[PDB]
Swiss-Prot record, chains A, C, D, E:
GO terms for cellular component: viral envelope; viral intermediate capsid. GO terms for molecular function: host cell surface receptor binding; metal ion binding; structural molecule activity. This is Intermediate capsid protein VP6. It comes from the Viruses. GO terms for biological process: fusion of virus membrane with host plasma membrane. It is found in: Virion. Signal peptide: none annotated. Belongs to the rotavirus VP6 family.
Length: 397, 98, 397, 397, 397, 133
């Protein structure tokens, strides 16, 4: 595996630092490394593909070295080189792809393909080099077992979930109380509604709460918390819990009262914020708990008083809400986010080559299904597969 | 490790006059030798020597293991056998340079 | 760590292979290894204890080797040796115990004690050897990154849970329908009851279901499945769900109809058995789902007919049940089971020395609490602590 | 075959006695053995798999040997070794599995696979060693011919059987007499019932008997015998023998009278116990016979007298029972038990790779079906297959 | 004695490591040890038998040695060896068996037979080696004397005892109060019953208690404690204390109230658990005390109220119970358990050879009788006899 | 300050470019830079912590330089190195954190900690490099 990495920074730091011009000396340390490779290869034989609509291709090696001679680089030098790189490019592609599809329950971590199982071989280790690529940097540290880590913008930690819970309801659904929400990606929106506007509630206040349990701990999270849930601020006709009928939601929004956000880790409060909207930091948590209340306005102008009668029918439904967005965070486990193309690369290669559903990943690499049951096997396979996608993107985008 | 030993070896075997031994042969000869047990007798003794090795070396009259530098007016110690001397059977707390 | 291990198989394969007589050559390969140790040691001081009722014994080293001369060991040889081992014995004990209590939320997987933090040192690794003790065999493979695995018997995967769920009930509790169960250790017993004997049920059949979610996946499980839940086959007076009153359960047992056991992994059916009682294999699962029905007997002799009237009072309560026992299984995580003394050793040492409750383990190392919230930290600490207990049991039982 | 064995204790006693540090002297006798192997190998090509959903990986060999130089292992030494072992590991797995599925009627006791048929070859024998693994120890002794033997906890000798026999019955099923039982695994529970409470029976005593014929002889069995059959001590509604109706069983339990347990071998009483409850030893038997009686109480308090009238209806059904459990025993034939994972390993590998039903084993390796018709062919195949599973578990769990 | 041991690990580590193939090296340290033996032997005449149906085979010694002039063991080498081992096998058997019957009050902890009395001789001690077999490991430590110890799955500490104690009774046995239990092996089930349902009891609570005194201390016990005693949850007709009549028990089960389990050592509470069901650890105890109460339900639905009238007749008998099982534990004294075959081996050899009852052991090596009066003499003889059985099982099962 | 920087790209471009396999020459320009550091260090002692729940660990130095065993590195070379880096890692952490808390109105744009105030010292400047971050 680490092998694989090199093969690339080799080519990039190659197809990049080698052109009509430049002095030898700025690549001396480079040329060398390169050749070393060629040698180890030549003679050895390979095979890739043979699964689904994936072409089976065989490759051999027998190439010249490099003029460690010349001072400057003449055009002619390049072309006689690019022609030799373009076999490694078109190669690696066919290599990544081959091990970017196979899954395995037991050792879902290690290599699978007849291509790679031969790479981890010892005689090839004579090639590692420059591992500053964020992903490999982390692959290694994970073998030595130590605190790893990645960087994500609008991460994808929440499996899609859009539902409601009626804490007080009746057949006519004309005087409900409960919450409705949307957890998806890096965002949570939750609204608490009370058709009665807490008319008979103690202290004329109805308490609400929304708890979200992350499948993986997030650390160093920068979060935006805002009052109101715009998504649940408009009239809706919704299916009843049993699917037998439909109810009407006609919200009127009030400011959420006594807002308290807790970021917990293993049941312990790590961060707590009381009514603080804007940007807040949650440094280490596996659970978010949002508590907020609807307090019946003690003083109401006529127009307001008219919305909240002492007796039914309750036609304007008092609603309070919150919106929370995780802009960035660090996770010890790989995840999909709003910037990285890893998930899309893996999913795309599998789709393009009609790769059959395997024993580890959900059909279509479905993110919601994956994160909902993010088993150790799925994570090890995902990391292997994401690391390969990142190696591939250094050369092929 | 190379020749040295090999040479003597063959000689004592009489039969052949070394020299005319392709260099690929003598070395290859080692390659094979360096993969066998060892007459318990032979072996059993070396194990013995190594265990005491250390003890001999420091136990000698002429020669001791390294010296330390403190540039810190240091207090001389006293030991019956040497009188007022500057020894120290323990180097710990200062880098070591083989 | 691995260090620690050796220190023992050293002594066992020692205090065992050294008896008045034996011809030397059974130990030549052994004696050596031994001495090597002594050397590395001598000169380094050690400290243990320092909490609760744990003495703070101090230790020192300066010992003669072991004449590898003789051909047949004479009694005199033994005694001059046993006297040197009995310092290492009484030592290691005080060593294990010291690191068998300290816990850490962050890196609660690595060494803690001032005794061990010094052992992982490099100048010590000159000792490791003969890692065939099932537990170390697995410690390494984990530090290296691979499919670990342990062997058990009547494993302890189910936190104690004894309860019921009334699917149909009323204040008088004279016509209930629901299930009651006991999940504990490696066993599950569940009964489905219907006071009405499905008199008004579609097809005169009442469906039941019991789902149990394991905190860790079990693989290669040999399981006994039997019809009936003896535990719920006798008359009971039970507390109501709200604790306000007590209800009467007067069961009469019928064979469970359409029994289906599913062993699922991440929502997928891995094994399914339809009405198969006796010994069945569940090869990989994190969830067990037992579905069974009560079917009103279509033909009844007078004595039977008399138990099931068309109208209340319902005095004989139709009950169907199942019993499932996991005889053996493999788990990638350490667990308590019915044969290993690890949990008991750790729990016992802590109790004997009045070790204060720490930040990781539940009070008293309570198994139910531990397995209910089996966090990564608790598992890493448990494995460290179980591995040490196993090292200790090689010499001290 | 024996070949196969070595290949493992080779690796275990290897991946175990080889770590950063240890003195060479703990492996001299070991290293050697190892190399010897490598030689015999490389040069020969292999093929494994095909049948069912099992990959066909091809394997080549040509690995350099070791060093007898360093008499103190340096990390660098390990890694250059582990990398060579991990090809043998991932190999053997693919080897065991391949011959752990093929079955053969005619001579289905020897090797089958194109992988193994080549191993029994002569040029390979140059490896065999350290046959201390309980199973191989027994494989050999069987090849030559001698009192083999294995050790089992809660053995699985009784095919599941749950039924009854009505010795006196009538259409209304209001005055029955007979027995009902559950034979499963290592346990037997049997109850004798007499609705009339022996009112018209000679000496007011009804005799009962339960005979169980083992498919294989068990020797050195430690057995728990207890009065009462809890499983048949509660009210039941049971299907009639012809399935046309259902009867009511309403037991009241009395102590079994004149209990006599006989452990017979070929019709001869080897052990006999009269009313001895607790732990008893049955040293060699192929049949268990439990005889017990229901004796009408000669003296009854009013409450008791009321349960047993002189004339029908008989509403309380006098029942006596016994429970017998074989805790441990030795068998000359392999069997499933409550501790060993062999059956589960074989069954699991076949299930995971969707191996088609063959000509020898019942679908799903069903234990009850297997032990019910435990033919010589099934036993020879089972032993071969169990021995391979045990070889595999030395490295892969 | 220790002598005896070697004679085996000699053969096992022999009949196992000696096969067509392997490199000498594996056995150099072994071969040697072996020969040494032969020498010491040859020339000494041995006699075995002379009691009951035990043949009297006499053995002469005149055997060659084992050339060390080879590298790879040729088949021919094996056979000329196996033929010499098969005399030692068939020998040792006849040796173990001979000293596996004789008993002595005075010095029972010592050797008896004309076969062994000659083995403890000095000129033989020249053999002893590799004492890692759990049992010998413990035999030795017992003669120098120290913290000995063993391991048992579901041990056999409780002599069979099934009885009751009526704390309140009257001739009609229509309003009883007391307890009934079953102590057997590693399990205890106890029920407390009160026909009056504590109608006239202080605080409407009836206290119960069950104390069990172990004959030996158990340490590091893993125990399952569950509410309810299924064994005493069904209707029974029982003999009165004086055997003159029979009473009726018609239980209805309630949850045991204020459950408290105490594991005491010499009258001191070492572990105490209040209402904790599931898995608990008892680290060192010689007594178990179970206290539990029946509390009349303060609130009862009609169906429940109907079972418990203010006046007799009391037809439904309120019962509360507990079940306790010792899954595993360590004992300083040998005991029978659910996995080891020692007791069964000793008992079986004595039964097969019609060995007459001796002065130490109860007839038939009856476990209940043995553990009930586990005198020092019985324990020393049992340990000697169990250790021999374990030596024998290394070769003959 | 700039000092601090180097200490890292030193380690990253280190714990990254140093693996069981690469040829020496792909790190010649690197090895050098590294050693240079070790020298300047060894001897001078440091204090970190001394505030809130921040541990006060004392760091002292004593390390041998770096071999060169030609033709790609042998595993043994790595381990004897990683063991020396893991003291600098666990160090720097405790260093950053210490100056990542102290604040100052007047001149709170400069170094504050007893750890860093000593780094801006002159005898250390001999390190700075690859400022592309
Ligand atoms: Zn068991």
């Amino acid at each position: 595996m680490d092998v694989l990495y090199s093969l690339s920074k080799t080519l990039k730091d190659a197809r990049d630092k080698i052109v009509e011009g430049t002095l030898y000396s700025n690549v001396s340390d480079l040329i060398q490394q390169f050749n070393q490779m060629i040698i180890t290869m030549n003679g050895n034989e390979f095979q890739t593909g043979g699964i689904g609509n994936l072409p089976i291709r065989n490759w051999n090696f027998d190439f010249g070295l490099l003029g460690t001679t010349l001072l400057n680089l003449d055009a002619n030098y390049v072309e006689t080189a690019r022609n030799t790189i373009d076999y490694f490019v078109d190669f690696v592609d066919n290599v990544c792809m081959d091990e970017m599809v196979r899954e395995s329950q037991r050792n879902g971590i290690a290599p699978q393909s007849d291509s790679l199982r031969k790479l981890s071989g010892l005689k090839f280790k004579r090639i590692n080099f420059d591992n500053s690529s964020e992903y490999i940097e982390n692959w290694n540290l994970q073998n030595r077992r130590q605190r790893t880590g990645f960087t994500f913008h609008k991460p994808n930690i929440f499996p899609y979930s859009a539902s409601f819970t009626l804490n007080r309801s009746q057949p006519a659904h004309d005087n409900l109380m409960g919450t409705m929400w949307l957890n998806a990606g890096s965002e949570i929106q939750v609204a608490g509604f009370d058709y009665s506007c807490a008319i008979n509630a103690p202290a004329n206040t109805q308490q609400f709460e929304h708890i979200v349990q992350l499948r993986r701990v997030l650390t160093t999270a920068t979060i935006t918390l805002l009052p109101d849930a715009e998504r649940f601020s408009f009239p809706r006709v919704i299916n009843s819990a049993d699917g037998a009928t439909t109810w009407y939601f006609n919200p009127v929004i009030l400011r959420p009262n006594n807002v308290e956000v807790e970021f917990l880790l293993n049941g312990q409060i790590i961060n707590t914020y009381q009514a603080r909207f804007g940007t807040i930091i949650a440094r280490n948590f596996d659970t978010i708990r949002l508590s907020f209340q609807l307090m019946r306005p003690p003083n109401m102008t006529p127009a307001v008083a008219a919305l909240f009668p002492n007796a039914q029918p309750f036609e304007h439904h008092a609603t309070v809400g919150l919106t929370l967005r995780i802009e960035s965070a660090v996770c010890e486990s790989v995840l999909a986010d709003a910037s990285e193309t890893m998930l899309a690369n893996v999913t795309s290669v599998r789709q393009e080559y009609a790769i059959p559903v395997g024993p580890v990943f959900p059909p279509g690499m479905n993110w919601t299904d994956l994160i909902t049951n993010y088993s150790p096997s799925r994570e090890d396979n995902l990391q292997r597969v994401f690391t390969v996608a990142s190696i591939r993107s250094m050369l092929v985008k | 490790k190379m020749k040295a030993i090999v040479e003597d070896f063959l000689k004592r075997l009489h039969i052949f006059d070394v020299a005319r031994v392709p260099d690929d042969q003598m070395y290859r000869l080692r390659d094979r030798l360096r993969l066998l047990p060892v007459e318990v007798r032979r072996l059993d003794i070396f194990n013995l020597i190594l265990m005491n090795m250390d003890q001999i070396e420091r136990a000698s009259d002429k020669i001791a293991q390294g010296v330390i530098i403190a540039y810190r007016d240091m207090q001389l110690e006293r030991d019956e056998m040497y009188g007022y001397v500057n020894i120290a059977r323990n180097l710990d707390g200062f880098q070591q340079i083989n």
